[PDB]
Design an enzyme around this catalytic site. Structure first.
Site, PDB file in Angstrom:
ATOM      1  N   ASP A 136      -3.284  -1.807   4.929  1.00 12.46           N
ATOM      2  CA  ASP A 136      -2.939  -0.701   4.029  1.00 12.46           C
ATOM      3  C   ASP A 136      -1.544  -0.887   3.448  1.00 12.46           C
ATOM      4  O   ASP A 136      -0.761   0.065   3.347  1.00 12.46           O
ATOM      5  CB  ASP A 136      -3.100   0.659   4.712  1.00 12.46           C
ATOM      6  CG  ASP A 136      -3.013   1.841   3.728  1.00 12.46           C
ATOM      7  OD1 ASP A 136      -3.283   1.657   2.518  1.00 12.46           O
ATOM      8  OD2 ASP A 136      -2.672   2.959   4.171  1.00 12.46           O
ATOM      9  N   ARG A 140       3.694   3.277  -0.541  1.00 12.44           N
ATOM     10  CA  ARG A 140       3.674   4.574   0.192  1.00 12.44           C
ATOM     11  C   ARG A 140       3.890   4.345   1.694  1.00 12.44           C
ATOM     12  O   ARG A 140       4.585   5.185   2.302  1.00 12.44           O
ATOM     13  CB  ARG A 140       2.353   5.309  -0.062  1.00 12.44           C
ATOM     14  CG  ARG A 140       1.130   4.608   0.512  1.00 12.44           C
ATOM     15  CD  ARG A 140      -0.100   5.495   0.507  1.00 12.44           C
ATOM     16  NE  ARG A 140      -0.004   6.582   1.471  1.00 12.44           N
ATOM     17  CZ  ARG A 140      -0.340   6.483   2.751  1.00 12.44           C
ATOM     18  NH1 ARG A 140      -1.012   5.429   3.181  1.00 12.44           N
ATOM     19  NH2 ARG A 140      -0.003   7.439   3.599  1.00 12.44           N
ATOM     20  N   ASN A 141       3.677   3.118   2.151  1.00  9.06           N
ATOM     21  CA  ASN A 141       3.832   2.772   3.566  1.00  9.06           C
ATOM     22  C   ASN A 141       5.099   1.973   3.844  1.00  9.06           C
ATOM     23  O   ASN A 141       5.178   1.261   4.851  1.00  9.06           O
ATOM     24  CB  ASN A 141       2.616   2.005   4.095  1.00  9.06           C
ATOM     25  CG  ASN A 141       1.480   2.919   4.508  1.00  9.06           C
ATOM     26  OD1 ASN A 141       1.703   3.996   5.054  1.00  9.06           O
ATOM     27  ND2 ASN A 141       0.244   2.479   4.263  1.00  9.06           N
ATOM     28  N   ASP A 154       3.210   1.984   8.763  1.00 11.45           N
ATOM     29  CA  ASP A 154       1.827   2.392   8.481  1.00 11.45           C
ATOM     30  C   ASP A 154       1.694   3.856   8.875  1.00 11.45           C
ATOM     31  O   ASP A 154       1.650   4.185  10.064  1.00 11.45           O
ATOM     32  CB  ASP A 154       0.802   1.521   9.217  1.00 11.45           C
ATOM     33  CG  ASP A 154      -0.634   1.836   8.810  1.00 11.45           C
ATOM     34  OD1 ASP A 154      -0.852   2.804   8.042  1.00 11.45           O
ATOM     35  OD2 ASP A 154      -1.552   1.121   9.272  1.00 11.45           O
TER      36      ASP A 154
END
Ligand SMILES: Cc1ccc(C(=O)Nc2cccc(C(F)(F)F)c2)cc1Nc1nc(-c2cccnc2)nc(-c2cccnc2)n1
Length: 277
Positions: A136, A140-141, A154
């Site tokens: 992922d 945004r992480n 994460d």
């Protein structure tokens, strides 16, 4: 044996202050930690959690304790001996990279942006070498500290990140460090655009159709030619043809250390035309 590289924190040392998100079975808090106060983020596992949740929670803490790298979020410690259980990490006043760049549009130099990418790539090279597939990777992480250092993290799903995900991971669930490389290419594009939405208003199905038909994201404005070339190679359909993270780190380091290399800009495809005398 799961918590070998982790420090156990006593609950009296932790103060939860304000809720900042949602975990898998518990809230995520901003708080304070007192050892040697430092701000921390705190993920909790609340009463009623299942055995699978406990296994996943403590395993996450365990894997995080194993990581020790400048570009990976740092684990402060774990509360496993008392309820609720907690994973405690450092906290970044600047927050997540996607929101950060969107709120600071146009405020950084090309060299600053490329330096953020080198750090992200170095963190990803470390994870891949440790045999950890992220699955992922997206702005945004990633957390940004007060020295502009990016820390891969994460936080869980926001929503399936189709437009960050390599075709083989979407099509047949093959997540590897090479699918993380595809994601890294999308992160390069997010950084160079100051957090634009990949593929703009295309739907998830339209994105997959475009990718399968051979289309790729166009160059960001003001983007070094070398940087666009690198992100394009991250998006090769054939998994085996993508650079490895070692290749990416090496290139970004060389470009930074010879910064005139970043002065040559890729042509930007204008969407509008303004005719003036
Ligand atoms: C508490 C916590 C627990 C686990 C993780 C985390 O990154 N775990 C993780 C798991 C697997 C792999 C990795 C890896 F490092 F990327 F490889 C990390 C991060 C954090 N820290 C964290 N900091 C922060 C945070 C927010 C703003 C400023 N500073 C930190 N937010 C959040 C958050 C927000 C919303 C939903 N879920 C978690 N989490």
């Amino acid at each position: 044996a799961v918590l070998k590289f982790t420090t156990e924190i006593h609950p009296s040392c932790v103060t939860r202050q304000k809720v900042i998100g949602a975990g898998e079975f518990g809230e995520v808090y901003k708080g304070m930690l007192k050892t040697s106060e430092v701000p921390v983020a705190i993920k909790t596992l609340k009463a009623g959690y299942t055995e699978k949740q406990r296994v996943d929670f403590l395993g996450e803490a365990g894997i995080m304790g194993q990581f020790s790298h400048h570009n990976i979020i740092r684990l402060e410690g774990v509360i496993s001996k008392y309820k609720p259980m907690m994973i405690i990490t450092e906290y970044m006043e600047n927050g997540a990279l996607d929101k950060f760049l969107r709120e600071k549009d146009g405020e950084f130099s090309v060299l600053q942006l490329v330096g953020m990418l080198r750090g992200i790539a170095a963190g990803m090279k470390y994870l891949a070498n440790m045999n950890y597939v992220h699955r992922d990777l997206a702005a945004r992480n990633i957390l940004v500290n007060s020295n502009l250092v990016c820390k891969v993290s994460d936080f869980g799903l926001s929503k399936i990140p189709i437009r960050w995900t390599a075709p083989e991971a979407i099509s047949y669930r093959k997540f590897t460090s090479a699918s993380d490389v595809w994601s890294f290419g999308i992160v390069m594009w997010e950084v160079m655009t100051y957090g634009e939405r990949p593929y703009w208003e295309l739907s998830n199905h339209e994105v997959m159709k475009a990718i399968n038909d051979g289309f790729r994201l166009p160059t960001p404005m003001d983007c070094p030619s070398a940087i666009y070339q690198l992100m394009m190679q991250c998006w090769q359909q054939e998994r085996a043809r993508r650079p490895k993270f070692a290749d990416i780190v090496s290139i970004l380091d060389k470009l930074i250390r010879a910064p005139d290399s970043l002065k040559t800009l890729a042509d930007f495809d204008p969407r509008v035309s303004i005719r003036l005398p």
